[PDB]
Design a protein around this ligand. Sequence first.
Ligand code: Y13
Ligand code: CO
Length: 166
Amino acid sequence: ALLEIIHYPSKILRTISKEVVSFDAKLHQQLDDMYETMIASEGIGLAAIQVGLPLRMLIINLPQEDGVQHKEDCLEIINPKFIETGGSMMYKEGCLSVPGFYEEVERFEKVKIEYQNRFAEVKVLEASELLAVAIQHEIDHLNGVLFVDKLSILKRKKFEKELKEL
Ligand SMILES: O=C(/C=C/c1ccc(O)c(O)c1)NCCc1ccc(O)cc1
Ligand SMILES: [Co+2]
């Protein structure tokens, strides 16, 4: 089923999500509704609070060569934790909770994370480029952080302008 996506400046997006403790059928349906909702709004990443669920879980499905998304590659990360981070780069980002606005944000260019899949299985994942960015972006949601929060002083004004523009 489709879920309503929460948009800035909703204070719900400032929520600190909680660890998932029960990996049951209820949790799996939520993840399924999140995937259906993400694809429907044509997103590549989605965190639980973006649909009102204060749980520390998020999904990521980057499009491949053909430029299309294949559910086969969808990542479901729960209770993520950074093991290591390195480098720095500027990446223009977007967000389903902040539709119509895109801006460069500084991110680690490489990250290694630890999490669990929907079956509570522990996983370790190293990532760079787009995948590393999506991971950092989505995890920020779990801590109530939006990418517009990380904008430089100048690009911050650009947001307020384009915001009053809509
Ligand atoms: O999926 C999205 C955004 C979707 C979107 C769709 C329609 C719009 O009009 C819009 O403003 C945003 N973001 C996933 C997280 C993410 C952001 C930046 C990036 O480089 C990697 C990952
Ligand atoms: Co987002």
